[PDB]
Amino acid sequence: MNELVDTTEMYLRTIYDLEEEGVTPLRARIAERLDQSGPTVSQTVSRMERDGLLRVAGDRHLELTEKGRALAIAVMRKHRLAERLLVDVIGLPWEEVHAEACRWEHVMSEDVERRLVKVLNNPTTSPFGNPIPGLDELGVLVRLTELPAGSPVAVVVRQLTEHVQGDIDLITRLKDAGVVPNARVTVETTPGGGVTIVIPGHENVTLPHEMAHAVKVEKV
Amino acid sequence: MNELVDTTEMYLRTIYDLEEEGVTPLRARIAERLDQSGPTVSQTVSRMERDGLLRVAGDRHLELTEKGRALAIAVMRKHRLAERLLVDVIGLPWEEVHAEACRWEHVMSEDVERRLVKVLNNPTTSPFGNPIPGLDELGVGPEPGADDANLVRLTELPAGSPVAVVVRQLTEHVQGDIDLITRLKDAGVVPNARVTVETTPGGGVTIVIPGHENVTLPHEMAHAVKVEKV
Numbered sequence A: 001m002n003e004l005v006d007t008t009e010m011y012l013r014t015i016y017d018l019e020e021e022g023v024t025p026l027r028a029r030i031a032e033r034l035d036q037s038g039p040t041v042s043q044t045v046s047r048m049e050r051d052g053l054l055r056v057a058g059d060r061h062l063e064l065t066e067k068g069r070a071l072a073i074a075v076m077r078k079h080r081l082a083e084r085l086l087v088d089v090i091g092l093p094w095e096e097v098h099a100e101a102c103r104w105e106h107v108m109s110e111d112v113e114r115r116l117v118k119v120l121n122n123p124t125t126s127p128f129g130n131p132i133p134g135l136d137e138l139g140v141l142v143r144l145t146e147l148p149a150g151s152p153v154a155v156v157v158r159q160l161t162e163h164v165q166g167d168i169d170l171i172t173r174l175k176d177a178g179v180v181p182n183a184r185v186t187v188e189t190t191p192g193g194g195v196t197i198v199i200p201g202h203e204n205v206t207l208p209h210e211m212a213h214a215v216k217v218e219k220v
Numbered sequence B: 001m002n003e004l005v006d007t008t009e010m011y012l013r014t015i016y017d018l019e020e021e022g023v024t025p026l027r028a029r030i031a032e033r034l035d036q037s038g039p040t041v042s043q044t045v046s047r048m049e050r051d052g053l054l055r056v057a058g059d060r061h062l063e064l065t066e067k068g069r070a071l072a073i074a075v076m077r078k079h080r081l082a083e084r085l086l087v088d089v090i091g092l093p094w095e096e097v098h099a100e101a102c103r104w105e106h107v108m109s110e111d112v113e114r115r116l117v118k119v120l121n122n123p124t125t126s127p128f129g130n131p132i133p134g135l136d137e138l139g140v141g142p143e144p145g146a147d148d149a150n151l152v153r154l155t156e157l158p159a160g161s162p163v164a165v166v167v168r169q170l171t172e173h174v175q176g177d178i179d180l181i182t183r184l185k186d187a188g189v190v191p192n193a194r195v196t197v198e199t200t201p202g203g204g205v206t207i208v209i210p211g212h213e214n215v216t217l218p219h220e221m222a223h224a225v226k227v228e229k230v
Ligand SMILES: [Co+2]
Pocket: A079, A083, A097, A098, A099, A101, A162, A165
């Protein structure tokens, strides 16, 4: 089958993901993250633009229309409710719920979502600390790249957005290092964009710049 | 998206469904149930035959190869574990779980299935009474006792006076007709329910339940119900 399960929904969530990372939603990012050629993402975006889902600007940045935004929120809502179910009730390992939820978000109905809100006891966040959007319509902080250079700082981990969950090796390293929602950790800025989690007496864990954008923390 | 989610997997499970119903698996039945044109299924069948998933027999019937049957079993196992999860844990109405699970069966990993057998307390049957197949591939060892009894499809009961039976299984085909599966739910025609059944002129069967309107099953749906005479 189609590896993306629902191509149009993944284009929408990817753009939403990029907005959550504070980076500019571009066709080049969609191609890299969804493993699709330049031509292919251009054709698909034009089709989505035709269908009133996206707006392409002269400078190349992609925006979601009001119509496309509501659909993006609905997919992300199913994604984060599925991750809570997978972690809290099913017991699938933390670092594995993202790939599973990335498939389930395309087939879950809103009736299951509403049942999950009650079964999971009104969850407001995913297992990675991200807010669950669209609960209203269902019917029911600093980023790691904004830190002074060359100096350590004590922070409280709040969110790990969807981009960083896509790198299993890295997400496993972060989990093992205690980089999980609501945990306290001290980080240090690496000269070339990346950030570093300080681990006393052990090799530190380096977050490349694109992954540092995907981690939201609170200054202690 | 593709409304079937995974077309090859629906092809595989439709042939398995037809075998559970005791009817000949045919391209025409796939076309009708999956809503595809004759050519489209003719072209998918050939491709799946060349991919070693099935074969077209001399008399036209469709047969799963060994390779295809293991794949069909994995889809059905996922389907029926998804149904158990939807009813026991999520609480989605019994009559709505089949359509949901028909989508979930194509995206559930074996890792999740392995967790579900533990979380659901070692299930062996779906909420429609059908045995969950291929549990040995998930690491479940068989339990003492064998699966069966004295099960007769409703289409095997003889024409005559009303017969008292206990419903044991409702296969995927009757679940796929939302109006009928909802009527069976509302009349209490569920696994282990006691009803009386009478054969109808054209191969159909009428189910009589005290306090509810009769539920008449066309012959194709009667094939999907397995009972035991009281
Ligand atoms: Co995720």
